[PDB]
Amino acid sequence: QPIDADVTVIGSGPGGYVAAIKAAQLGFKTVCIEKNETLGGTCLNVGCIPSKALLNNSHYYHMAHGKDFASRGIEMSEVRLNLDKMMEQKSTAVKALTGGIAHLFKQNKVVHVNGYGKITGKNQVTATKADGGTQVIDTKNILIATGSEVTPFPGITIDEDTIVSSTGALSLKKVPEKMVVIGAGVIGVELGSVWQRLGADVTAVEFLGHVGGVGIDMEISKNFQRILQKQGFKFKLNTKVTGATKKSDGKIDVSIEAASGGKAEVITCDVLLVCIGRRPFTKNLGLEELGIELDPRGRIPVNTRFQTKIPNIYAIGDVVAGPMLAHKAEDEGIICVEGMAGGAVHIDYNCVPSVTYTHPEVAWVGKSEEQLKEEGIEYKVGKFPFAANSRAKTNADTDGMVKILGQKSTDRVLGAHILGPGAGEMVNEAALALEYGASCEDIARVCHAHPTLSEAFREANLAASFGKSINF
Amino acid sequence: ADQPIDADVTVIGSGPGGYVAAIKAAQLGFKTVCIEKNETLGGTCLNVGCIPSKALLNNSHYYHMAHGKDFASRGIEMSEVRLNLDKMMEQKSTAVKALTGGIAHLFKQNKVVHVNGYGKITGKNQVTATKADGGTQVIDTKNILIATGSEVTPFPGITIDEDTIVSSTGALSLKKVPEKMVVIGAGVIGVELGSVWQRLGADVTAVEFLGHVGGVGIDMEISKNFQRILQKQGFKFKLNTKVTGATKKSDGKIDVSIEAASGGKAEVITCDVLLVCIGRRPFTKNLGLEELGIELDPRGRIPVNTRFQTKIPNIYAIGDVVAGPMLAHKAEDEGIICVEGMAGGAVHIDYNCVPSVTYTHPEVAWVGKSEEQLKEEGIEYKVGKFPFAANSRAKTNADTDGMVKILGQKSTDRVLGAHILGPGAGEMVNEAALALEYGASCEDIARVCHAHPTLSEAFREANLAASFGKSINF
Ligand SMILES: Cc1cc2nc3c(=O)[nH]c(=O)nc-3n(C[C@H](O)[C@H](O)[C@H](O)COP(=O)(O)OP(=O)(O)OC[C@H]3O[C@@H](n4cnc5c(N)ncnc54)[C@H](O)[C@@H]3O)c2cc1C
Ligand SMILES: Cc1cc2nc3c(=O)[nH]c(=O)nc-3n(C[C@H](O)[C@H](O)[C@H](O)COP(=O)(O)OP(=O)(O)OC[C@H]3O[C@@H](n4cnc5c(N)ncnc54)[C@H](O)[C@@H]3O)c2cc1C
């Protein structure tokens, strides 16, 4: 019964399932171990894919129900929401994509073992299926793609009915009247905006005095806040959550206190969303037996080749340090199995972009103005408002700006910050530019098609290199 | 009449080429004068071209989705969806109005002098315009920049009255949705304007001399697939067919006499509105070229060298008035690098890096060379294809139409061509433009991390399918 393999990847997330396909195409005998019953990990089942679907569907409702569609001569009498069908589109997408990973596994001759795998040896990993039937796999190299889980709030138990986590908010059966979201990060802002667009009164509470989560420019974050609040988003900043108490009616009273602690308030909501953070998932893997010591935050330490202290054991994804993003895990999985094949392993996390898929979109790659302030790097600022982009005025989507940060002397593009429409796809152009080591002059002299939103990317680069943009 | 103005650069034209070149040169330390005959700055693209058409293309697609099964299928239930064409056109007009004022504000912000009139080159170092009133304005300038632009290429024997027989202009300000419409010319402008009204309930039949759609330099695979998707959207395409003539009738409808390009297969089809857009051509009327002896080319474009200079050194010409793709970003770049050469610099622009976008839904955008262009040149290539049905962000949005085709050289793996048919192709092609400018290979693009989930992931995954041979998610 025990199968032998070359590379055994524990995990079907973005990291694992991509690494599984890649390694198999590289000539390796690969085995993917999945504890859940649907391949895809967090991003496909409970993470990126479902949230983006609801964000799109809600935004389309917001435009119809709002002044937008009427403003373009699309006059409608009755706009109504069938939440069952909106969620049906979410379900249809996730189902097809999960099955795709399965088809891809067979297309690329990857072995799927459904079970809870545990490393039972330097060259041995044992999975436990729910039934109890053993499946031990001995392999030369082991890849840990176990992923992450939701960080629990002290004293607040998520029941996924009235007090939900990221998971529960994605399969809610009714729109809350008032909703309190703990955590003003990417996951929080997105899910809050979804229900706010669907008629909920959404108040978000944050210990920190900024929005948008990790590594967001303050100018970008502040302007993001201003636009969201006008859309109807309520933000309680610099505030610690004292506690949560469920009531007889079924509502949740949320005890709130200032970050200093001076002013306490108790607000009510129909649904409480908890998403203060996510944490690496290293439960029951055997790491303690093998003596791979975790880090204080719980992430598996690895070298630049993504090997653990034990050489033939590798670890990639949310389980290791770095941005807890899906394309990060994807790249880390590819380059890891490519180093096993004999290649070199280099990844600059400065090139890794971060996208908030709201409307307006927020996407950034590189370093914020603040990060450069601390490091001592003097920079020039280039800003082009979307109110001057032709395609944005054409589409009546004049919100936000593109901020390009270039070194005062070398003109190297140090950071790219895009607040506004289509920022999620625009940041991939900045990623390509940063990898090449481009300057602000390089980007400006490349012809960008007219009229496109990407023209703001070029014009902001010009305003940083030359000092003056053409159309502003 | 007024005192002769002396300047460094005098730009004849307020189009994308002229108005950008005017701003750039003024910021470069030159004394600049922009001469525009019309009363709204912006040229074709702002007044009659890109901006108005893209506005209606966007508004029509939103209508098509609401009126269609799409919005309901995602849980957006609407009882009565109706079209107030008056307001749809009001949004188009409001945008163009504001953008026209923007060019004016930009000119005043950058100390550019605007002279409204029909300019005439009255000297190697002098240009005098004739304003509508007749009061003349003499401008002495070291160098003169010709950005006069283009005009509608007329079909022989069909006179555009801008009521029943319209050009691009009239199709953009129609006052009622035609029941049946015939478009002469299945190019970019034709497909877009046809799709707009087809989505608004017109039965749109477009006729083309050639056996393909999408105009110049489109891959045949891309063009054929483009046709299929539009045809299911309700687009009628009579290809390989020449228009013998058009007759306006007593009722006011237009009978369009049709014959095959091969000959025979004759039919007379009827329509309520006839749109003529078989091409555009450079506008060089009353420019002063005859006095100075600058001879035009057979197709009517002003010949220029690599520095965009005419036969006369201090006279330069950029935009649709010269050869090359008749695109708005083309004129913009040529204007910048021309005035950058005037201040002191080298002038190089690769037309292979210039992208071409069809702003329909699905969008078509390509940069570089098609499979056909490479077959004639003798460049052997590898094909990399990633369908949008496998891109995560496309499946999430229920927008799985189309694919991305990457063409790479057999040996060097240099990205020779990038072809994107599908959602968001207009913004994705700028990434391919950036790659081609740097001279990147398919390996280079694939190893750059693309954010998940984004449509651009198809760009990366197709590059991988051309470099390595196997895509990850396909
Ligand atoms: C609501 C939400 C929205 C998000 N939106 C975005 C976004 O827009 N963009 C973005 O880039 N990221 C986003 N993320 C983050 C993204 O989901 C993660 O970064 C990504 O899932 C990381 O994948 P991974 O490779 O680390 O593996 P994960 O998918 O994190 O790992 C989970 C998988 O490992 C398996 N597994 C774990 N332990 C075992 C074991 N012992 N045996 C067998 N199988 C095991 C599980 O069964 C599961 O399949 C979002 C996350 C959430 C929660
Ligand atoms: C319907 C339509 C849609 C289009 N869509 C797109 C698209 O999506 N993308 C794209 O890239 N391109 C598009 N184009 C093409 C685009 O409009 C042109 O390529 C662009 O306008 C070229 O600008 P230009 O600098 O050559 O000057 P133009 O804009 O062509 O015109 C220059 C100006 O100079 C003026 N002028 C001429 N002679 C004189 C004179 N003697 N004295 C004073 N003033 C004078 C003219 O009146 C005009 O205003 C479209 C065109 C049309 C018609």
Numbering used by the authors:
A (entry chain B): 3 to 474
B (entry chain A): 1 to 474
Published text:
Dihydrolipoamide dehydrogenase (LADH, E3) is a mitochondrial flavoenzyme operating as one of the components of the α-keto acid dehydrogenase multienzyme complexes (the pyruvate dehydrogenase (PDH), the α-ketoglutarate dehydrogenase (KGDH), the α-ketoadipate dehydrogenase (KADH), and the branched chain α-keto acid dehydrogenase (BCKDH) complexes (c)) and the glycine cleavage system. The role of LADH is to regenerate the catalytic activity of the above complexes by oxidizing their E2-subunit-bound lipoic acid (LA) prosthetic group and simultaneously reducing an NAD+ co-substrate. The LADH reaction is governed by the ping-pong bi–bi mechanism, which is structurally supported by two separate substrate-binding sites; the dihydrolipoamide substrate is oxidized on the si face, while the NAD+ co-substrate is reduced on the re face of the isoalloxazine ring of the FAD prosthetic group. The LADH/E3 component is a functional (obligate) homodimer since residues from both of the monomers have catalytic roles in each active site in this dimeric enzyme; the redox-active disulfide bond (Cys45–Cys50; the numbering reflects the sequence of the mature human (h) enzyme) resides in one of the monomers, while the catalytic base His452′ is part of the adjacent monomer (indicated by ′).
The disease-causing I358T mutation was found earlier to quite significantly reduce the specific forward and reverse LADH activities as well as the ROS-generating activity of hLADH (in the reverse catalytic direction); the respective residual specific activities were of similar magnitudes (41, 30 and 53%, respectively). According to the domain structure of hLADH, the residue Ile358 belongs to the dimer interface domain. The residue Ile358 is also in the close spatial vicinity of the isoalloxazine ring of the FAD prosthetic group. According to the I358T-hLADH crystal structure, the Ile358 to Thr358 substitution led to no significant structural alterations in the hLADH structure. Neither any considerable displacement in the neighboring peptide Cys449′-His452′, nor any significant changes in the active site could be observed. Near the mutation site, the dislocation of the His329 and Tyr359 side chains could be observed; the hydroxyl group of the residue Tyr359 moved closer to the carbonyl oxygen of the residue His452 (catalytic base). In the wild-type structure, the His329 side chain is in H-bonding distance to Pro355(O), His-452′(N), and FAD(O2). In I358T-hLADH, the His329(ND1)-FAD(O2) distance increased to ~3.6 Å; the weaker interaction might have affected the binding affinity and/or redox potential of the FAD, potentially contributing to the observed reduced enzyme activities. In the H+/H2O channel, the residue Glu332 could be modeled in a conformation that pointed away from the active site. Owing to additional minor dislocations of the channel-forming polar side chains, altered polarity and geometry could indeed be observed near the active site.
